Amino acid sequence: LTLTAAVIGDGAPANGKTAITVEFTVADFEGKPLAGQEVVITTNNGALPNKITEKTDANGVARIALTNTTDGVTVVTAEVEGQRQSVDTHFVKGTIAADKSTLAAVPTSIIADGLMASTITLELKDTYGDPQAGANVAFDTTLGNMGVITDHNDGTYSAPLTSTTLGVATVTVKVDGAAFSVPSVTVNFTADPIPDAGRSSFTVSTPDILADGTMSSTLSFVPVDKNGHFISGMQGLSFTQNGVPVSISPITEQPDSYTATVVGNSVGDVTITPQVDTLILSTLQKKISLFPVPTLTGILVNGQNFATDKGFPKTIFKNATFQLQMDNDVANNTQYEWSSSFTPNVSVNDQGQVTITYQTYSEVAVTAKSKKFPSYSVSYRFYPNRWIYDGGRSLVSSLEASRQCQGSDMSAVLESSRATNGTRAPDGTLWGEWGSLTAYSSDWQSGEYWVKKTSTDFETMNMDTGALQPGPAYLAFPLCALSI
Numbered sequence: 208l209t210l211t212a213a214v215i216g217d218g219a220p221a222n223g224k225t226a227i228t229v230e231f232t233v234a235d236f237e238g239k240p241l242a243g244q245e246v247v248i249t250t251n252n253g254a255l256p257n258k259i260t261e262k263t264d265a266n267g268v269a270r271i272a273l274t275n276t277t278d279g280v281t282v283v284t285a286e287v288e289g290q291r292q293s294v295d296t297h298f299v300k301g302t303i304a305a306d307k308s309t310l311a312a313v314p315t316s317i318i319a320d321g322l323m324a325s326t327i328t329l330e331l332k333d334t335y336g337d338p339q340a341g342a343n344v345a346f347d348t349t350l351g352n353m354g355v356i357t358d359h360n361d362g363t364y365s366a367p368l369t370s371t372t373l374g375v376a377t378v379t380v381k382v383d384g385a386a387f388s389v390p391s392v393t394v395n396f397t398a399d400p401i402p403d404a405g406r407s408s409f410t411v412s413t414p415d416i417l418a419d420g421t422m423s424s425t426l427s428f429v430p431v432d433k434n435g436h437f438i439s440g441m442q443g444l445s446f447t448q449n450g451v452p453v454s455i456s457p458i459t460e461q462p463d464s465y466t467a468t469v470v471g472n473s474v475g476d477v478t479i480t481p482q483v484d485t486l487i488l489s490t491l492q493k494k495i496s497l498f499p500v501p502t503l504t505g506i507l508v509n510g511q512n513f514a515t516d517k518g519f520p521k522t523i524f525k526n527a528t529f530q531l532q533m534d535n536d537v538a539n540n541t542q543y544e545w546s547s548s549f550t551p552n553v554s555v556n557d558q559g560q561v562t563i564t565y566q567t568y569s570e571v572a573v574t575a576k577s578k579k580f581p582s583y584s585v586s587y588r589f590y591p592n593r594w595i596y597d598g599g600r601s602l603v604s605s606l607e608a609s610r611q612c613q614g615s616d617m618s619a620v621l622e623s624s625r626a627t628n629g630t631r632a633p634d635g636t637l638w639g640e641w642g643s644l645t646a647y648s649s650d651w652q653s654g655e656y657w658v659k660k661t662s663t664d665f666e667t668m669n670m671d672t673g674a675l676q677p678g679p680a681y682l683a684f685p686l687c688a689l690s691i
Contacts, residue, residue, distance in 0.1 A: 208241065209234045210285060210292040221298035222337040223255070223276035229294060230270040231285040233263050240267025244287060252281045254298075301333030303342070305388035308332045310380060312368070312392040319396040319436055321371035324354070327378050329364045329389065338362020343383050350376040351396065370396040373436055398436030402483055406431035409481050409491035417580055418497040420472040426455070426493075428465040428481045437463060443484030451475030451497060471497045501543065501577050503585050505532040506633075509642040513633040515587065521635035522625065522688075524595035526648040528562040531555075531587050533575055543575040543584075561587075566594040566691050591691060593625060595637055597650055598685035605665040605680050608657040612687035621688035623658040623666050627673045637688075638673035645670060656686040 215228040233244045242262075246269040249258045254275040263269045275281055278300040284293040309330040317323045327346050331339045340360045346353050351370035358364055368376065376394045380387040412425035426446060430438040444465060446455050453471040469479065480492035506513045507530040513519050520527070533539045540559040547553045552565040555573045569590065576584035598611030612620045627638035634640070644651035655667045658675065666677045668686070 208236060208288065208290065209238075210287055210290045212283075212285065212292050212294045214294050214296055218297050218299055219274070220301050220333075220335050220337060221275055221278035222301065222335065223274050224337070225335075226272040226274045227281075227296045227298070228270060228272050229283045229285075229296065230268050231263075231287075231292065232266070232268045233287055234267055240265075242267055244269070247286045248283060249286075250281055250283050252279060252298075253277045254281045254283075301335055301337050301339055303339055303382060303387070304332060304334045304336075307334070307336050308387070308389045310378070310389045310392050312378060312394045315393065316395045316397060317368075317370070318399050319370050319373050319434060320399070321369055321434070324367035324369045325394045327353075327366050327368055327392065327394075329380055331362050331364060331382075344387075345381040345384075347379045347381060348376045348394075350374050351394075353378075368394060371434070372396065373398060398438045399432035399434060400438060400441070401432060402430040402438060402481075402486065402488065403433040404488050404490050406433070406435060407481075407488060407491065409479075409488070409493055411479070411493045411495055414494065415496045415498060415579065416470070417500055417583060418471055418474045419500050420454070420470050422580065422582070423468040423470045424495050426467045426469060426479060428458075429463065430465070430481070430483065441465065441483060445482050446479050447482050447487065448477050448479050449492075450477030453477050453479075453495070453497070455479070469495060471495075473497065474499050498579070499534065501575065501580075501583055501585050502534055503531060503575070503587060504535045506530070506587075507532055507537070508640065509646050511631050511642070513640075517633035518589070518635065519633040520589060520591060520640045522593040522595055522637045522640055523563045523567065523591040524637075524641075524644065524647075525564060525650075526562065527641060528560060528647065531559040531561060531573060531575065533559065533585075540575070542578055544578060546574050546576070548572040548574070566689065567591050568691060593621070593637070594689040594691050595621060595644075596687050596689070598687045600650070600652070600684070602654075602682040603685060604682060605657055608665070608683065608685035611685045614687075615689055617690045618687060619690075620657055620659040620665065621686045623660050623668070623675055625688070626656075626658040626668050626686070627675055629673065629675070631673070638668070638670075642673065643671045652684070655681075655683040657683045658686060 213230045219225040219227045233241045242265050244263040247260045248271045250273050254273045261269050275298045278298045281296045311328050312325045317325050344364045346366050354367035356366045377391050379391045407430045410427040416422040416424050451473045456468045458467040478492045478494050481488045503515050545555045547555045549571040553571050555561045561573050572586045572588045574586040627636050632639050653671050658666050658668045660666050667683050
């Protein structure tokens, strides 16, 4: 009898799933099909199944469906009562397809530890969508250290990726030395979010500030991890404060630090320390000292102490002098640099001692500049309107005094209304503001001095008592005043 074969579906992928079929038909010497005939069919090259035995159907056919994970030529042979027939079948290796493959990084964010690793996984598939193992694969990264590629013999390949440097890595693939276009993946190599007290630092621009609620000190926090990495995108960062109440501005992240400013309205100390949620870097704490604002507390004039908002002095004369007082004690004056805006007419020494030497003609200012905080200074302003001086030391008549004090159009015997008021005070009068002139120089003696009520009516004033008295016009000292 005869044994003829027909191959159906040849050239199947060598995926061990798709099958090639072979139909053997057994016929008699004449050409008719024989049924119920026993047929043994065998395959080679590792194909499955290897051997099958069966009977021919009514059309005298006995078939086999075979698969193979091994490409190349698979021979299938049938044997029946001596007769033997063979045919070659072909299994083709798959063709790797980038559009059917995948690449992933997990996790996608890693600490630039040099140890923590992202596992890069490639799912290598072919054109038919089948997995391809044993391929020569390599991963490439723009940054970091790619580990060793392990073929999981299932179609997937993996390798650990680490980095000691900060940055973003792009991983790509290469099969058989050539680039394989599966979409690249990224891996952000970041810093440990936990600051290392030792490498991190905390700085204040200035340790001492004025308690005016305006002068500020800048806080600069630089958090570095245990690897020496600067830590960015920090959440839960704050600046604690211990001491006098202070105002800390919101914090601003920079590319290399975290800053903020602080001002305060209460005198005292305060230690500011960085805290990153749960962690308080106490070894970084810094102190800021808020000082009292320099302030003019009074004017010391020949035994008195006048307030600063009275306009003193309205009158002046050669050698007149007073001591401005800073912060309730003149001992504090050496903490400032003293200067006058109109010299030498108005002089000031290092003790805040102001002494008049010549007349003024406009407003004048004596300024005290803080040595500690140079940007701060306080000034005492005044604008005298009377310049007093003598018209002789000898005792003269009122007519004499009158002429002697009229050396200028703006000269005349001092008006009594401006000479005194009885007591000492910043009332704009000569005696009221300065007291007895005898206390300033040797040009003024104790005694009666002529003062003026009207052009013809002269009065007299006691220099030591500041007392006015209208009546006995004998002789008296000429008291001149130049309006200025």
